[PDB]
Curated annotation (Swiss-Prot), chains A, B:
Component of the gamma-tubulin ring complex (gTuRC) which mediates microtubule nucleation. The gTuRC regulates the minus-end nucleation of alpha-beta tubulin heterodimers that grow into microtubule protafilaments, a critical step in centrosome duplication and spindle formation. Plays a role in neuronal migration. Belongs to the TUBGCP family. It is found in: Cytoplasm, Cytoskeleton, Microtubule organizing center, Centrosome. Ubiquitously expressed. This is Gamma-tubulin complex component 2. It comes from the Eukaryota. It is linked to Cortical dysplasia, complex, with other brain malformations 15: An autosomal recessive disorder characterized by global developmental delay, variably impaired intellectual development, speech delay, facial dysmorphism, microcephaly, and varying degrees of cortical malformations including pachygyria, thin corpus callosum and subcortical band heterotopia. Most patients have generalized seizures. Transmembrane segments: none annotated.
From Swiss-Prot, chain E:
In vertebrates 3 main groups of actin isoforms, alpha, beta and gamma have been identified. The alpha actins are found in muscle tissues and are a major constituent of the contractile apparatus. The beta and gamma actins coexist in most cell types as components of the cytoskeleton and as mediators of internal cell motility. The gene is ACTB. One of its GO terms (molecular function) is ATP binding. Changing residue 59 to A: Impaired methylation by SETD3. Belongs to the actin family. One of its GO terms (biological process) is platelet aggregation. It is an enzyme of class 3 (hydrolase). Actin is a highly conserved protein that polymerizes to produce filaments that form cross-linked networks in the cytoplasm of cells. Actin exists in both monomeric (G-actin) and polymeric (F-actin) forms, both forms playing key functions, such as cell motility and contraction. In addition to their role in the cytoplasmic cytoskeleton, G- and F-actin also localize in the nucleus, and regulate gene transcription and motility and repair of damaged DNA. Changing residue 64 to E: Does not affect methylation by SETD3. It holds the Pfam family Actin. This is Actin, cytoplasmic 1. The modification N6-methyllysine is found at residue 69. It catalyses: ATP + H2O = ADP + phosphate + H(+).
Curated annotation (Swiss-Prot), chain F:
One of its GO terms (biological process) is gamma-tubulin complex localization. This is Mitotic-spindle organizing protein 1. Its main location: cytoplasm. The keyword Zinc does not apply. Required for the recruitment and the assembly of the gamma-tubulin ring complex (gTuRC) at the centrosome. The gTuRC regulates the minus-end nucleation of alpha-beta tubulin heterodimers that grow into microtubule protafilaments, a critical step in centrosome duplication and spindle formation. The keyword Membrane does not apply. Keywords: Acetylation, Cytoplasm, Cytoskeleton.
From Swiss-Prot, chain H:
Component of the gamma-tubulin ring complex (gTuRC) consisting of TUBGCP2, TUBGCP3, TUBGCP4, TUBGCP5 and TUBGCP6 and gamma-tubulin TUBG1 or TUBG2. TUBGCP2, TUBGCP3, TUBGCP4, TUBGCP5 and TUBGCP6 assemble in a 5:5:2:1:1 stoichiometry; each is associated with a gamma-tubulin, thereby arranging 14 gamma-tubulins in a helical manner. Gamma-tubulin at the first position is blocked by TUBGCP3 at the last position, allowing 13 protafilaments to grow into a microtubule. This is Gamma-tubulin complex component 3. The gene is TUBGCP3. The chain holds residues 7 to 129 of 907 of the full protein. The modification Phosphoserine is found at residue 100. Component of the gamma-tubulin ring complex (gTuRC) which mediates microtubule nucleation. The gTuRC regulates the minus-end nucleation of alpha-beta tubulin heterodimers that grow into microtubule protafilaments, a critical step in centrosome duplication and spindle formation. It is found in: Cytoplasm, Cytoskeleton, Microtubule organizing center, Centrosome. Ubiquitously expressed. Belongs to the TUBGCP family.
Amino acid sequence: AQELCLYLTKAASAPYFEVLEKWIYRGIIHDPYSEFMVEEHEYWDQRYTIVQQQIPSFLQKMADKILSTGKYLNVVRECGEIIYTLKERAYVEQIEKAFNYASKVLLDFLM
Amino acid sequence: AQELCLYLTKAASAPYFEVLEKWIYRGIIHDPYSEFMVEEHEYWDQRYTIVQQQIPSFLQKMADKILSTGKYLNVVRECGEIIYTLKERAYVEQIEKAFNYASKVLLDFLM
Amino acid sequence: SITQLFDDLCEALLPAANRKRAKRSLKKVAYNALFTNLFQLPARNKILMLSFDLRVGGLGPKADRLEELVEELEAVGSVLDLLVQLAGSGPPRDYFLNNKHVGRNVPYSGYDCDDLSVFEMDVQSLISREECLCHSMIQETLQVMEAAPGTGLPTVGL
Amino acid sequence: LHSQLQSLTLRRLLVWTYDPKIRLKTLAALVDHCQGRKGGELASAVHAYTKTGDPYMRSLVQHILSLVSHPVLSFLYRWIYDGELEDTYHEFFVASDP
Amino acid sequence: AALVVDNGSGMCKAGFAGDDAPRAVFPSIVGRPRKDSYVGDEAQSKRGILTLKYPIEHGIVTNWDDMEKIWHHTFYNELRVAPEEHPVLLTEAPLNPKANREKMTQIMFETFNTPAMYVAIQAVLSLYASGRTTGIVDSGDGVHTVPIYEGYALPHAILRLDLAGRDLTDYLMKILTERGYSFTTTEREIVRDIKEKLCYVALDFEQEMATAASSSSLEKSYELDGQVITIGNERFRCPEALFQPSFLGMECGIHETTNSIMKCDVDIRKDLYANTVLSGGTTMYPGIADRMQKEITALAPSTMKIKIIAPPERKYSVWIGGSILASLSTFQQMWISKQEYDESGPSIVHRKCF
Amino acid sequence: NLNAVRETMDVLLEISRILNTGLDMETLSICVRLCEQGINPEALSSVIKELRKATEALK
Amino acid sequence: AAAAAANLNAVRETMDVLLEISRILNTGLDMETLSICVRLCEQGINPEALSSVIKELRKATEALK
Amino acid sequence: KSPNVLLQNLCCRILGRSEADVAQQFQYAVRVIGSNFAPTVERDEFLVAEKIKKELIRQRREADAALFSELHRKLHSQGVLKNKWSILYLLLSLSEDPRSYATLFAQALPRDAHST
């Protein structure tokens, strides 16, 4: 029953991990139903804010780097693959490889 | 009734001959219940001493080479298969092939 | 130690229990048979001819694996030439299989009825195994329970 | 056994059910020796049944140990390579202090 | 049980077919006072009061009276069997004169009354022991490069080199003496031991000489009466003579001699290059396989695949090959029976043991 | 090097497992090292099939 | 005997007629290659698959020439 | 022979090489032939015939369209050919014009309607 509950979560997470690859590698947030961990609004700390409930509790370690990764992509845009595995952190490492670039394009954009 | 009493002793001796292959090829003595022919203690002739009762009376010929085989393995360790057959001595010869090496590793260790 | 590597080989194939003279006689069968061939074509091609026969009877991905290893084993040739000789001598789940209901971007297919037809044979073989067991368990013990007194018993044979 | 009742008799059952009179003798006495043990202390009380010598029991219990000791070797391979112990119930022998 | 007797220029090896190793090994010597005849170790032990004879000094039997005594010794003293009760497989040197083969046959059947016998070439048996029937093979005490194809030695391509273990022992005595020690007396036995225990074949002679000249990293100690002596470049200079016989005043080395391949049909030369097998006590030097590989590669075409096979048990591969052969099912029909001998005489050996 | 010759020996077990050869892990290292000597593999196919044949006559 | 020679005749006929249909259709095949494609089609093989192969090996023999 | 050894003769006929030389192509030929062995469409020589006539008529070669009808009967006259649909389906595909739309005209049946 541990091979089973890994077959469900591997398939019940493809939709969530397909809105994430749009919020990190780009700035757009689709989320038609209110389910994503990052929601937007309409001076800059109230633009995007974490929702605490809808956190996968296995990305809870990096709940601040995700929100900080897309946020840097938007202050430049308006100016001008991930798979789930157990006991393997190939996606936790995959997020740090993009946040470490998300800043190097904005920080350089201001210097 | 000689094929039978050979089928019992062939099966009532596998546990005993599995603590022996640990006392000759290594120095460790497991013997949870007090049954083995060699017991330990806690200057070196009182460390391991033969118990006279618990001798198989078909290894009585080599009751001194067994005790002398593991004893040499321990004064080096702390510094840094057998099957029963009748009228065939394949295990009596198998013990001499290890005691003849047990000394050649310690004697060389002191020269 | 070519004279010894044939002596260690003869030990492994010897089934555990006279075990002291059989090894002496089996080393004859090793030598009596080694010199018959000596008295009397690429390497990777022989695998593909066995890769073909795999894909025909189904099990495609396994055949795509057999070729996946011989491609990395290049970066020894006479070793695989020995395995292809003994190919037939050996002794006789994953939910992320077809499962059109899980994926990121699964393509349009329409009904198949050729995956569900080979998903009921996966079950029919199960109920046909646990039924031969009950045919090979009540037989192995009724052949002894009902016979002449003292046939299957080994102690009466003394 | 039920498919043949439609022939077998009492004296025929004794030989049929002479072996499962032992497996149902070790298991029914393996669940009493470990009653209040939870966590690793249970994987240490189903290992004190292997020092038996009986080739039929020592090869049965030495299989249940290979399943019971799988979760224990799951924390160990976690608390060694990643150092992130997680057990809401106190099982692992490494107890953390908040 | 069938007997296997390997007649060596320096040491004879005897035992029973089927066994993994010979049961006995002894010096090929017969001695008489300066018990009337002494053979083997005893002759050696009491050499002080005897005049020693070496009836097969260079691999070929030269004195049949003493060779008969060595065989008598082999059966009754070493193996403790009656030859008239066991078939006997004997070994012979490469290029053994036809007349000698008949003599050996006649002696076995008429003098020892063997029920059956056979004679095989030493090099061929060693090749068999390596699991091959084709390849080029033997350096012993007193004396070959033997090309073999499909189980048959090719006499036209066989080469004999009168340079072996004995010469190397004497050469070591000479250079150790030049070092400042003194090994000259029948001391020869001590040096033979030093040779077998501390010598090796250097991959590159000059580099090894340079290392030994500028450091003590290659030096090894040897204890005699307690005196501990030092052996330096002599360790590899001794066996170097196998590759450069001029060190001994002899005009080709073993690598160059292994010329034998070039004497064979061009169509089988690649099989020989890919199957060069070493045998004999004098091929036991550590490093000899890699040195041969390097030297042969330098002599052969750049496109040639070279492989040197050096079995760990090659010191007794001749005997072992005989044990294997005599144990083969298909070989039983090959023995020369007493019946066949009575029917055809000694010359049958040429047909039966081709 | 022993790390490389372990991997190359570990990959070679699988291609002998899906080809349905009875060679286990021990007999494989024996045969790999023996083939590494230079013996012709067309003959080894006969000794293993015969050693396994005479082994069955005992049981 | 005879029935083993009457079959070798009825095969040389058919292999000669299939070579006529092959030339009026202007397939690049010849008498040697065409005997391979006939044997394959006897065991049962997709001609939509086998013809993709021939349309490829003939498409790669030019990049090497 | 067997189809696996027979596929390698083909790769040696088209490409002029020995089986020890060409082994990348033969690796690609086992990929396509294998897993595509079973015939996918219902087999009938009638439909394939009315498409080799329709093709030789389209090239203004109306004389060879009536010669094929006499060569296709001889195939039935001798009777050493078991699958006559396959070998014609293939000879038609490799046909080149010495000198568009095909969902309108007659195509073979799919075999999906049946429970294969």
